[PDB]
Design a protein around this ligand. Structure first.
Ligand SMILES: Nc1nc2c(ncn2[C@H]2C[C@H](O)[C@@H](COP(=O)(O)OP(=O)(O)OP(=O)(O)O)O2)c(=O)[nH]1
Ligand SMILES: [Mg+2]
Ligand SMILES: [Mg+2]
Length: 280
């Protein structure tokens, strides 16, 4: 019955289909022809819709997916946690977006979200992901991404439409070594902290982790801060004022004065790190 939907017929023109399966709370995309993990950049890792339907039953995956590319005309709008227990919209922002972007809408696989597929072009000044106090989120992509396909047509909106997408500027937020290189380096060296557990002096985990950052970042106080904000030790206390400074900066500066050596990127002195790896 899926191939009856006009929008699914439109997507089946493209050999950009995959299948996905729930690992933990992630949704990994897989090559429908052989079952390997599918890249989002390798077109030969995908298949057409017939191969995705066949591969779905073969490996028992959770459902179909569609990879978005620059040259196809589609735009993927992801609305998370915007539906009731009986699948009506409970967020007023999502209610207004659906009024001004009337195109193919379907219920996402968790039942509490929506997908809208539109032909158009995204504004270049908006963030990919926008999070709201409500707990909902708006995530938009036109390439370098795949979308789960359910066919659960919402509100009978079963047709991809050609719409202007400047209206998204009213919903998404606007937007104007290497940090990730250091993060991966610290992870591989066993120096990336685990999330704090019950009965853990979080403030003491902060300081220990901040000491390591002082080494691996070369006491680059602004880099240590950018990296700390992506760690499982980040919390609202980090930016609370304390004596004409924030708790986060007082921690980072204390670490910079505590640590003696520094990791020189050009010297590879990983053996100079004075802190033992995080046990597992
Ligand atoms: N897990 C995962 N998802 C990806 C990747 N590239 C694109 N995606 C897609 C699959 C998802 O449909 C899309 C949005 O993520 P979501 O958390 O919102 O899952 P989805 O909307 O499909 O269902 P749900 O929100 O839980 O109701 O991101 C990837 O490398 N890993
Ligand atoms: Mg979603
Ligand atoms: Mg596209």
């Amino acid at each position: 019955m899926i191939m009856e939907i006009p929008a699914i017929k439109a997507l089946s023109r493209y050999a950009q289909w995959v299948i996905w399966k729930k690992e933990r709370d992630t949704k990994i995309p897989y090559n429908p022809n052989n079952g390997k993990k599918a890249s989002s950049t390798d077109p030969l890792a995908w298949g057409d819709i017939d191969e995705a339907q066949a591969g779905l039953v073969r490996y028992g995956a959770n459902g179909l997916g569609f990879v978005l590319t620059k040259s196809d005309p589609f735009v993927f709008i992801d609305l998370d946690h915007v539906l009731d227990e009986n699948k009506r919209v409970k967020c007023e922002w999502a209610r207004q977006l659906l009024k001004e972007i009337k195109s193919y809408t379907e219920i996402s696989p968790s039942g509490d979200g929506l997908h809208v597929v539109v032909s158009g072009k995204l504004p270049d000044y908006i963030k990919h992901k926008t999070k709201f106090d409500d707990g909902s989120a708006l995530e938009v992509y036109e390439s370098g991404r795949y979308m789960t396909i359910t066919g659960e047509v919402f509100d009978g909106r079963d047709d991809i439409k050609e719409l202007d997408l400047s209206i998204l500027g009213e919903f998404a937020e606007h937007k104007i070594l290497d940090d990730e290189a250091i993060i991966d380096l610290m992870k591989r060296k066993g120096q990336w902290p685990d999330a704090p557990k019950d009965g853990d002096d979080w403030s003491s985990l902060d300081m220990s982790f901040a000491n390591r950052l002082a080494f691996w970042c070369g006491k680059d106080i602004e880099r240590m801060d950018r990296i700390f904000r992506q760690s499982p030790l980040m919390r609202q206390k980090w930016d609370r004022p304390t004596a004409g400074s924030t708790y986060g900066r007082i921690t980072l500066k204390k670490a910079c004065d505590f640590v003696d050596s520094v990791y020189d990127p050009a010297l590879r002195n990983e053996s100079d790190c004075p802190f033992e790896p995080y046990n597992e």
